[PDB]
């Protein structure tokens, strides 16, 4: 009747964007950056080795002071670390062991975690008593939780496996917004530098930049073959690198609206579990499942380092707010802290 | 420093509680509970007693954790690796769904959908050496159905005989033939009783045999 003409009307808007995209694809960025300096063999060394998790580490996140960090692990523990002296500031017991994400609040007052129980639990660090206790639990998701990210002390955004992201108000404890555009499970978030947008990659190999105050998908980014496992934002705020089970990672752009650089290698047939950018946005760091975190020179598409100290797959990694350290927690139950020497 | 010596002294109070909790959680038996849906999973939880439903049913000096991922309408390949170190996997299959069709698309009648899932759980690369416990759930209901209709709508290559104890030579052996890793697993099989002993005693007896053969692979003798 008309549903198969709207099958044609749907692709009528898709091929129009195709010719608008390769027209503004006037030059590949690698032939402009033929003249820039390759950074050389980035060599880092495990300065600290944070040990005390007893199962797979599924997520970690740094505090904003670049010194405290939280790590989540499959043994149902959330540990606050002093990365300077490897000594544990807090260990938080979780209500469900199956935890796939964790976040640190930008004030450091709060830490979130969530996972297969479809709840982002919010924990209060700086109590007038001595303990860390649960502020609010955020129920309302249908699939598992993949990534919690605080905007401030009262607003957190969570992605889930029900194809929906969601903005929350932690005070009332209920989602002010809900972001429904994806068709597969959303697997990772990263908030913007100015925290007025975010972007989420899903199991349908698509990425979608959102608006936290409007509530709808600004742009939609394709280019991957298999599921997207890892988003982080570039420090500019106008790029983000997706890390896939396709054994590839690609760099995007919101103002250009297509993939620009893809970071792969033919000896790498193993899928990316984590992505993070450096302070200059010159070292994409990515944690693979050939057991070693690779360190990608993000401007040139040639791997410039490897943090090969891990006995199982590298599930999480984060560069600090001053670019000084890098942790790579992993499935061998250790976080290792990497800083390159002169 | 003085205060830095009381922060170090605190972190090894944290450390000896992450060690005390983690040697009380290696003495626990973790068990995935999979299945086809309406396949008697809800029955055996009521015997052995919104996302994960971790059921803990510690009964004979051995602490069990059973994780029912039932309402996880999402891609299974994206969260199944969390259960990699798991002792066994309890799998339910409805015997009465032999000639009973599935309600999806009138495909192969609701046990080739169970057998499609069993082949995806046996040969899964996280379950290379996690031996699956198999339950055959609706034993009473298909005997009244095997007298009315033969076991040819599901398996047309069967022998016949229309008998209650015949279908073990049809149904159980068909599922244990899907075990492509015949040397690293075992597919311990059962017929779900309606008594309190012989459906959770089997879960205790056949999970000790996972533990014994996990020690022999740890102590070199295997």
């Amino acid at each position, epitope marked *: 009747s008309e549903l198969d003409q709207l099958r044609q009307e749907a692709e009528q808007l898709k091929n129009q964007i195709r010719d608008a995209r390769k027209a503004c694809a006037d030059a590949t960025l690698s032939q402009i950056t033929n003249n820039i300096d390759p950074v050389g063999r980035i060599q880092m060394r495990t300065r600290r080795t944070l040990r005390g998790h007893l199962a797979k580490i599924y997520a970690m996140h740094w505090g904003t002071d670049s*010194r*405290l960090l939280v790590s989540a692990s499959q043994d149902g523990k959330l540990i606050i670390w*002093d990365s*300077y*002296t490897t*000594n544990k*500031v*807090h260990a938080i017991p979780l209500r469900s062991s199956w935890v796939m994400t964790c976040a640190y609040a930008p004030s450091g007052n709060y830490v979130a975690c969530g996972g297969l129980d479809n709840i982002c639990s919010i924990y209060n660090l700086k109590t*007038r*008593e*001595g*303990n860390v206790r649960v502020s609010r639990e955020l129920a309302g998701h249908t699939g598992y939780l993949s990534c919690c990210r605080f905007l401030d002390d009262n607003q957190i955004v969570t992605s889930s496996g029900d194809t929906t992201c969601a903005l929350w108000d932690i005070e009332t404890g209920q989602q002010t917004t809900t972001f429904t555009g994806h068709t597969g499970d959303v697997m990772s978030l990263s908030l913007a530098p100015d925290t007025r947008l975010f972007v989420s990659g899903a199991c349908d190999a698509s990425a979608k930049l959102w608006d936290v105050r409007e509530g709808m998908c600004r742009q939609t980014f394709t280019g991957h073959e298999s599921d997207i496992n890892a988003i982080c934002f570039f420090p500019n705020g106008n790029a983000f690198a997706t890390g896939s089970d396709d054994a590839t990672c690609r760099l995007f752009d919101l103002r250009a609206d297509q993939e620009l650089m893809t970071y792969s290698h033919d000896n790498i047939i193993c899928g990316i579990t984590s992505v993070s950018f450096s302070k200059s946005g010159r070292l994409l760091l990515a944690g693979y499942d050939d057991f070693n975190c690779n360190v990608w020179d993000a401007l040139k598409a040639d791997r410039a380092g490897v943090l090969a100290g891990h006995d199982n797959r590298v599930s999480c990694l984060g560069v600090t707010d001053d670019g000084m350290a890098v942790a790579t927690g992993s499935w061998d139950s250790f976080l290792k802290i990497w800083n390159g020497s002169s | *420093s*003085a*205060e*830095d*010596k*009381a*922060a170090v*002294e*605190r972190s090894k*109070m944290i450390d000896r509680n992450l060690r005390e909790d983690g040697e009380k959680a290696a003495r626990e038996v973790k068990l995935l509970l999979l299945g086809a849906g309406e396949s008697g999973k809800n029955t055996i939880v009521k015997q052995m007693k919104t996302g994960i439903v971790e059921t803990h049913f510690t009964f004979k000096d051995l602490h069990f954790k059973m994780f029912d991922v039932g309402a996880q309408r999402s891609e299974r390949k994206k969260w199944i690796h969390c259960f990699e170190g798991v002792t066994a996997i309890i799998f339910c299959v409805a015997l009465s769904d032999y000639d009973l069709v599935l309600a999806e698309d009138e495909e192969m009648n609701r046990m080739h959908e169970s057998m499609k899932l069993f082949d995806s759980i046996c040969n899964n690369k996280w379950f290379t050496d996690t031996s699956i416990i198999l339950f055959l759930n609706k034993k009473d209901l298909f005997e009244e159905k095997i007298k009315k209709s033969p076991l040819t709508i599901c398996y047309p290559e069967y022998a016949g005989s229309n008998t209650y104890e015949e279908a073990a030579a049809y149904i159980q052996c068909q599922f244990e033939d899907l075990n492509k890793r015949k040397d690293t697993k075992e597919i311990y099989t059962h017929f779900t009783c309606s008594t309190d002993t012989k459906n959770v005693q089997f879960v205790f007896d056949a999970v000790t045999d996972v533990i014994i053969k996990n020690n022999l692979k740890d102590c070199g003798l295997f």
Partner: single-chain antibody
Amino acid sequence: DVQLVESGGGLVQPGGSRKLSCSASGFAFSSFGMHWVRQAPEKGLEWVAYISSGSGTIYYADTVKGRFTISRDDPKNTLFLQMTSLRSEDTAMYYCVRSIYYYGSSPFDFWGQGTTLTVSSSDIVMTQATSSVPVTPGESVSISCRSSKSLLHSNGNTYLYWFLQRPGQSPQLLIYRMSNLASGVPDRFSGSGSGTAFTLTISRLEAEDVGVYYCMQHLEYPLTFGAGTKLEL
């Protein structure tokens, strides 16, 4: 909220014994280090003892070390001090101080109301050479004291602590580790300094900011106090 209240003592003959207990309620007492601090009549404060959280590290005051005994019991949530062979310098009001040490905590913040004990008959020095200052509400006050050793440590902080004891009240942490304001203090107070000389500033005086303003160190034990700096109205 948080509440420490201690018992035991008041009048004892000299050469005797006394058991001071401190009942804690409102916080996670098994996760806190616990001090005792005394204050003799019309004198300053003087640190008495210490237990680390988990009873691993016990210090004492080198004045009466080996005479006193500090103990805690976490399932009871009390803090004990056994004081035996009691002299005449032991006459003081004894306070129960709460203190927690991790990265970024505020030690020495909650002080109990106290109990009194009367009878009938090297290390760093903190010097507040000013004894009292006449001051009118509204102006900027600046209190200063001196140390013997440099209080700055090689890890980066400066263990100088400030406290205000209002008249008829208990001490109250204002600034911990030379700069950082405590919880619930008004923003008018501020702390500063460099190395061995420090300056506590108030910007606006109010009627409850009168009292005696002490300065403590915490760089190594003993936690030596100084004589106080009075502000009267």
